[PDB]
């Protein structure tokens, strides 16, 4: 079966260049188009350019000309994207995609086989663990409580409740990127109001890039 396996994700600084590779195995390589398509968080896919490896004929989207290079190695069946002049508008997952083959091999142009994606984040931020603040249950049925996981970089953080013992009613929201360049997210849980006096609730936050673990007890606010 055709497999497209991409290189690993990276944080890149603004102004730098990034190279992403895609090793294609198990199918026609040189006489079909491989394309690079990117997708920024929350947005749709965007085609950037493609190459037919046999003689390295390339086609670049007009908006990328001058900053984009696409290359291919026929002996190692690998395609490459090089993208220079990076800015935060280039933060995206980058995919390699190969066209399908139709009737007796006819190139279909549509993107039938896809790599797993390479997550590129363009930022000047340094790696930084989150602060963790309580979202305390109201004094004023069902109660909601939570933790605000603020000011970390890069993604991701993971949150559990009571070391995994509490899963019902938990919502851990997607992070938002703040104007400071740091991320923030909340995790909440709804529980019986009658449990607030007797049940301890602890959010367990893990930010692996900074080796940070925080366990925050969340309790009704006194007075």
């Amino acid at each position: 079966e055709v497999q497209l396996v991409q290189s690993g994700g990276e944080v890149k600084r603004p102004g730098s260049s990034v190279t992403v590779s895609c090793k294609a195995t198990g199918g026609t390589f040189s006489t079909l188009a491989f394309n690079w398509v990117r997708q920024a968080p929350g947005q749709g896919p965007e085609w950037m350019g493609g190459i037919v490896p046999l003689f390295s004929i390339v086609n670049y989207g007009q908006k990328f000309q001058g900053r984009l290079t696409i290359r291919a190695d026929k002996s190692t069946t690998t395609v490459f994207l090089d993208l220079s002049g990076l800015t935060s508008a280039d933060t995206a997952t980058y995919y390699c995609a190969r066209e399908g083959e139709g009737w007796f091999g006819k190139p279909l142009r549509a993107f039938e086989f896809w790599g797993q994606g390479t997550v590129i984040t363009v930022s000047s931020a340094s790696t930084k663990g989150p602060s963790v603040f309580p979202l305390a249950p109201s004094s004023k049925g069902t109660a909601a409580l939570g933790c605000l996981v603020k000011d970390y970089f890069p993604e991701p953080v993971t949150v559990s409740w009571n070391s995994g013992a509490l899963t019902s009613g938990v919502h851990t929201f997607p992070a938002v990127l703040q104007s400071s360049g740091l991320y923030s997210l909340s995790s909440v849980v709804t529980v019986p109001s009658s449990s607030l006096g007797t049940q301890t609730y602890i959010c367990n936050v893990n930010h692996k890039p900074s080796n940070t673990k925080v366990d925050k007890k969340v309790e009704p606010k006194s007075c």
Binding site: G44, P45, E46, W47, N59, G61, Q62, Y95, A97, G100, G102, L108, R109, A110, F111, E112, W114, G115, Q116, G117, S131, F133, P134, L135, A136, S138, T142, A144, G146, L148, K150, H171, F173, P174, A175, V176, Q178, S184, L185, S186, V188, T190
Partner: protein, 214 residues
């Protein structure tokens, strides 16, 4: 630059029902060069239909495509649980291919009003010089909801961010978290902090509020 416009933005349908998704091109698509893709969260798109109507091997026969010129459709004869996803069309008849903006195909369920909760900033965070005020909308349907922050009756703009969970796998609802961020000095200049929620399941808007320092 050929523009692809998909309709509707969100298609809400019931499991087992037939689904019809539309795409229109701003100019005629050459050689019927129109493809449809499905995308699930965190995964690459998957090609469902190419050259208007052809299915690749491995795509179930419940998916079919039709159309010509500027108007194209994807039909799903009955919606299996795995078919709720985002769908994109793509024209590739020119040398600069373009994608539509996507149709979210989600599960239709009974209207559910959100439960709304407001959280003041912690005393601990206030020492950092920033106040985050959080409003939670829990387990609602449909996904469209309006959250307005009011501080001493003044509508806030520009100083909040929100995010929304994926449709819940057990109950088909959404939840939403909105965070209002103020400097500590601005936070201590005002008294009443309120989140006001409008939603089809609420007969009139719900406001949750607190008075700073009480």
């Amino acid at each position: 630059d050929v523009v692809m416009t998909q309709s509707p933005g969100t298609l809400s349908l019931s499991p087992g029902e037939r689904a019809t998704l539309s795409c229109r091109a701003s100019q005629s698509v050459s050689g019927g060069a129109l493809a449809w893709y499905q995308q699930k969260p965190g995964q690459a798109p998957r090609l469902l239909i190419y050259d208007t109507s052809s299915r690749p091997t491995g795509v179930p026969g419940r998916f079919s495509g039709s159309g010509s010129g500027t108007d194209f459709s994807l039909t799903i004869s009955r919606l299996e649980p795995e078919d709720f996803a985002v769908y994109y069309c793509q024209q590739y008849g020119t040398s600069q291919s373009t994608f539509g903006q996507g149709t979210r195909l989600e599960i239709k369920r009974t209207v559910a009003a959100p439960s709304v909760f407001i959280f003041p900033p912690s005393d601990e965070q206030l020492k950092s010089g920033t106040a985050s005020v959080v409003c939670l909308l829990n387990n609602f349907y449909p996904r469209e909801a309006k959250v307005q922050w009011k501080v001493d009756n003044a509508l806030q703009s520009g100083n909040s961010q929100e995010s929304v969970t994926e449709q819940d796998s057990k109950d088909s609802t959404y939840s939403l978290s909105s965070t209002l961020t103020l400097s500590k000095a601005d936070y201590e200049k005002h008294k009443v902090y309120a989140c006001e929620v409008t939603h089809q399941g609420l007969s009139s808007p719900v406001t949750k509020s607190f008075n700073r320092g009480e």
